[PDB]
Amino acid sequence: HSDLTFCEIILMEMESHDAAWPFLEPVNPRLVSGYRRIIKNPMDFSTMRHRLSRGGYTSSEEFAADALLVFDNCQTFNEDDSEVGKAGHIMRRFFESRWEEFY
Ligand SMILES: CCc1c(-c2csc(CCCN)n2)[nH]c(C)c1C(C)=O
């Protein structure tokens, strides 16, 4: 629980980031046609927050994998020059920068 505090900090910094707006909650299939058809494993920051809050991450590596899944999904579905596409690249580098401050 307490040993993952730094992942909690990274998640908060991600949630508070200017480019985080597409990723705060799960993508709504009634708003994005066929999204979950194309993306088998959706992921978002609120889902990660709830998993951290219940102690559902057995390692920091599992948390990092969910973070990358947010950005891999975004790059799979969104054009690179779209608003969400741009935000995903910005956020991926932000996450990578924070991760390499510990690893
Ligand atoms: C463009 C739709 C989209 C949003 C989006 C657009 S507007 C918004 C804010 C909702 C309220 N916080 N999210 N996000 C993601 C990851 C999307 C896709 C297709 O991948």
Author numbering: 1796 to 1898
Give the exact sentences the study uses for this entry:
BAZ2A is an epigenetic regulator affecting transcription of ribosomal RNA. It is overexpressed in aggressive and recurrent prostate cancer, promoting cellular migration. BAZ2A, however, features a shallow pocket, making it one of the least druggable bromodomains. Here, we describe a structure-based fragment-growing campaign for the identification of ligands of the BAZ2A bromodomain.
The 3-aminopropyl substituent in compound 44 performs better than the N-methyl-2-aminoethyl group of 45. Binding poses of compounds 44 and 45 are similar: all interactions of the acetyl-pyrrole headgroup are conserved with respect to 25, but the charged tails do not point toward Trp1816, but instead approach Glu1820. However, as observed in compound 36, Glu1820 oscillates between two conformers, one in contact with the compound amino group and the other exposed to the solvent; this interaction seems to contribute only partially to the binding affinity. Instead, compound 44 is involved in a network of water-mediated interactions with the protein matrix. The thiazole nitrogen forms a hydrogen bond with water W4, which tetrahedrally interacts with the main chain of Pro1817 and water molecules W5 and W6, in turn in contact with BAZ2A. Water W5 is tetrahedrally coordinated by the terminal amino group of 44, the Trp1816 main-chain oxygen, the Leu1819 main-chain nitrogen, and W4. Despite the observed interaction patterns, both compounds have poor affinity for BAZ2A, most probably due to the entropic penalty deriving from the freezing of the alkylamine tails and the surrounding water network. Notably, in the structures in complex with 44, 45, and 47, an ethylene glycol molecule is sandwiched between the thiazole ring and the ZA loop. It forms a hydrogen bond with the main-chain nitrogen of Asn1823, an important anchoring point already explored by the BAZ-ICR and GSK2801 chemical probes and other BAZ2A inhibitors, and a relevant indication for further optimization of this chemical class.
